[PDB]
Amino acid sequence: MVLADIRSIGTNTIDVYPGKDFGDDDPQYQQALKYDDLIAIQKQPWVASATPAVSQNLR
Amino acid sequence: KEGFDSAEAEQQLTRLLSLRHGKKDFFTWNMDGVLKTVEKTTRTLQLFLTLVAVISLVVG
Amino acid sequence: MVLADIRSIGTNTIDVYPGKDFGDDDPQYQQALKYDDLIAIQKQPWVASATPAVSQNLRLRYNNVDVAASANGVSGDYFNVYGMTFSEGNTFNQEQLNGRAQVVVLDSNTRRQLFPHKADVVGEVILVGNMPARVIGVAEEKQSMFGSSKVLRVWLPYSTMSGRVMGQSWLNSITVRVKEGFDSAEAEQQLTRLLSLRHGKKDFFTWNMDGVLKTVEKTTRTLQLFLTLVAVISLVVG
Amino acid sequence: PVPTYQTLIVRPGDLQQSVLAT
Amino acid sequence: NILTLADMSAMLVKAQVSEADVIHLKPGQKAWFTVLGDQLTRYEGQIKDVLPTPEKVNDAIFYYARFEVPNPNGLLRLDMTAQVHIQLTDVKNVLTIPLSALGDPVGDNRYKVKLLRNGETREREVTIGARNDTDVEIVKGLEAGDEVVIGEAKPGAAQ
Amino acid sequence: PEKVNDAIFYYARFEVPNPNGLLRLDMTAQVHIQLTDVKNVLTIPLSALGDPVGDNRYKVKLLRNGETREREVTIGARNDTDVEIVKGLEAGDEVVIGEAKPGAAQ
Amino acid sequence: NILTLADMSAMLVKAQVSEADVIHLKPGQKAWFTVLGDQLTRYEGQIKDVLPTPEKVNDAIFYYARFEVPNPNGLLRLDMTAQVHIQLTDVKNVLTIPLSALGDPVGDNRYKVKLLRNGETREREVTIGARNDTDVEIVKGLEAGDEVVIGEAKPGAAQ
Amino acid sequence: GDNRYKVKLLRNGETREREVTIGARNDTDVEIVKGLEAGDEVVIGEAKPGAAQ
């Protein structure tokens, strides 16, 4: 039960962190990330998939 | 995929992103390996519990 | 062991929050949170103590090495109540908490970068942001957590940070420790009403710790129940 | 458990209060 | 603005002391400073005065002060960072307790454990007035030459 | 008034004498203003309050019957310790400041 | 502003050296640079001078320096990024210690075990400020030709 | 980030790296101009310098 709950995440994530780490601000604020990259990023055969992720609040 | 190890490729992707971008920056957090170790942990708990139980039962 | 790791954060803590909850931005960005607010907040008898919290990453020039680093305006009970071990030096007196000394705590790793020499830390001064700061204490991490890949981190009395290198009244949060062995559920709503009072609106947004504490306690003791019971039953069968 | 204690020899010192500034 | 000019025969420093300490700082008090880039090469001189008009960086007001350092050899580029030590008073022939091991009951009373010749640590209440960035000028309750368990002190604890 | 984002503010002025040349310009200054007595009236402890709507103000209290009962009250003045209560509660009444329950006998 | 003009026959560079090192950088010192887009095609020349007026980027003050690279071929577009290696010094007839072997006691002291003619190794404290990515410059502290234990250094321990 | 070692396999069956200069970083493969001979096998997977296969 617990293992299926955990491995439910796609085996389990390598989210891009363009800064330093979770506590970072400005270098993390500046971001050269490109979805175009995902092309060659997906080029590696072992990579079953890799996906875009972004979000924001709005009124 | 492949059942492939998380420990590998991330370093390949490390240099990869160190290339496709001119500088290291992606600074991503490791996958699956945490699942690996927690799996070893839980199965280890299975080992302790089931083994002491069965030993006690043999004592029975 | 595990509880000591958990109760290492004592009883209790009501960190003050803006906005709504953890994910909020602008309402959370704005903070109607005077540190003065703590006065009446500390006035409540059931409270044992309550402390301010704030933090700011900033560039740090020094001799030759010149890099930005995160920093943390906090209580002197911080490393104390966390029980965090010191690489060197001590925390600070409340008197010198009022003294606004340029004393400061740093990562051991930060020293690793700053000091290839491994020179003695105490009495040395390094500017933070702009203000010079006479470093003294530095503390070793009390956790492994190597996967955290921790970066540069720094600690100040909050009075100095929020004060003479920020000046804002609105700190990031305020720890609130109850006395009496008092329940987490009760009074937190009363403090909620308190913020519904001293502020005119629903802005408490705080999280809490005997809830999760007591429940994981029941959980672990429950594990003790299952394990010890099945064991003893099997042994009686023996 | 060693009762070892870090310690110092107090002496009639002279005040060095001055502070600093960027 | 065609072109700016400047006289570098002598360099002025803007020492931005915090507003909390500006009440002191009597003119002509002697002070010294040093640049980050040369690590250890002390410069020194008289303080000149205090600027009447403050400017702030968001939080916390700051007040300037000036020196008049000589500039041989063409060193010291404009707007170079410079750490600055301003001098407060030097009362002497008096002990000051390191803050590392202070005990402060009530916030007024002040116990302090110290090692004895017996090897027995024992605390004493002490009164203290003056306080320092690093220590506190004790006035009563402890003799000079006393061993003082700066680390992990407890009362009554023989070592 | 000149606002600073949230909350409007209003100024007030003194005229302090300045001997000895002290007090630099734009120095921070903590300020106490005297308000006034509002005596001859009950003031409720802050914890004791029941505060529905944020307008309404029920107040559970103990009766001679030993049964608690709330009374809605009007309260304007507020203090760090208590709040003034002009109406809705008689003097000499006990007030179940702790673990109050409306309609409940003790 | 109808239009603008520029003499593209000599491309001046704005090498923004940090304030920590501006105290050095003596004029006429030889230096070289390279662009990101051509990877490996070194350009080089004399340093010309240093600009008196710094311009900060929030944190950390910086000071410019200029060269005078020839520009044939019509290459080198304006405001191109350029990595810059400014010759710090050309010290010579002087020993340097490999980084792997050196020990660094206290925070200033530097023990360095060396083989002796006796064949018994002995450490020596050495004074070193100058340092490179691969080595630390030792003007003084070790007699020339002494062998040094690059690995597993042990004072007083013969090989 | 300047130097470019490249482990390859020899006829000996022993792998050996060679430092190489490379200009173009074409998206599929980089363009090596020097430091490696043609016809050489290249241990693209799980490479180890100085290691016989």
User: Distance between CA G25 and CA G88 in Å, rounded?
Assistant: 7
Decide if H41 contacts H9 (C-beta within 8 A). Answer: yes
CA distances from C13 to C6, C211, C215, G59, H47 (A): 13, 11, 16, 36, 52
Mutate to test the interface with D, among C102, C125, C135 (most CBs of D within 10 A): C102
H or E segment and range at residue C28: helix C26-29
Resolution for this PDB entry, in angstroms: 3.3
Name every chain D residue with its beta carbon within 8 A of the beta carbon of C125. 20
Paired sense of beta strands G62-63 and G17-18, if any: antiparallel
> Which residue, A55, C233, F104, E78, is CA-closest to G55?
E78
Beta carbons of G107 and C59 less than 8 Å apart = no
Phi-psi region of H44 (alpha: psi -120 to 50; beta: other; left: phi over 0): alpha
The interface residues of chain D toward chain C in range 1-22, judged by CB-CB distance below 8 A, are 19-22
CA distances from H3 to C175, G135, H6, H18, H21 (A): 51, 18, 10, 10, 8
Residues of E with CB under 8 A from a CB of G: 4, 6, 35-38, 75, 77-81
Beta carbons of C58 and G59 less than 8 Å apart = yes
Backbone gaps in chain C, preceding residues (C–N over 2.5 A): 208
Cβ of residue C150 closer than 8 Å to a chain A Cβ:
yes
Question: In the C/D pair of chains, how many CB contacts fall below 8 A?
Answer: 10
Task: Please provide the distance, in angstroms rounded to a whole number, between the alpha carbons at the two ends of chain E.
Answer: 75
User: Which chain C residue has its CA at the smallest distance from B52's CA?
Assistant: C231
Residue that is written with structure tokens 């004791």 in the block = F48
> Which residues fall within 8 angstroms of residue G89, CB to CB, at 6 or more apart?
G24, G29, G130
What is the token pair recorded at G60?
A: 């950390």
User: Distance between CA C114 and CA G69 in Å, rounded?
Assistant: 36
Decide if E16 contacts D21 (C-beta within 8 A). Answer: yes
Task: For D2-21, give one letter per residue: b (16+ CB within 10 A) or e.
Answer: eeebebbebeebebebbbbb
User: Distance between CA F24 and CA E23 in Å, rounded?
Assistant: 8
What is the token pair recorded at G133?
A: 């990515």
User: Which chain E residue has its CA at the smallest distance from D7's CA?
Assistant: E149
Decide if E110 contacts C95 (C-beta within 8 A). Answer: no
User: Which chain E residue has its CA at the smallest distance from G59's CA?
Assistant: E81
Question: In the C/G pair of chains, how many CB contacts fall below 8 A?
Answer: 29
Q: Which chains touch F (3 or more CB pairs under 8 A)?
A: C, E
Name every chain F residue with its beta carbon within 8 A of the beta carbon of E19. 24, 27-28
Exposure of F44 in the CB half-sphere (CA atoms within 13 A): 32
Whether chain F lies against chain H with 3 or more Cβ pairs closer than 8 A is: no
**Least Cα separation, residue F24 to chain E (angstroms):** 7
**Least Cα separation, residue A30 to chain B (angstroms):** 11
Beta carbons of C190 and F49 less than 8 Å apart = no
**Least Cα separation, residue C64 to chain D (angstroms):** 16
Q: Which chains touch E (3 or more CB pairs under 8 A)?
A: C, D, F, G
Burial of E159 (0-12, 13-18, 19+ CB in 10 A): middle
Residues of G with CB under 8 A from a CB of H: 39-40
Decide if D20 contacts E31 (C-beta within 8 A). Answer: no
Cβ of residue C67 closer than 8 Å to a chain G Cβ:
no
Cβ of residue C190 closer than 8 Å to a chain F Cβ:
yes
CA C199 vs. chain centroid, Å, equals 24
Q: Which chains touch B (3 or more CB pairs under 8 A)?
A: A, C
Name every chain G residue with its beta carbon within 8 A of the beta carbon of H21. 40
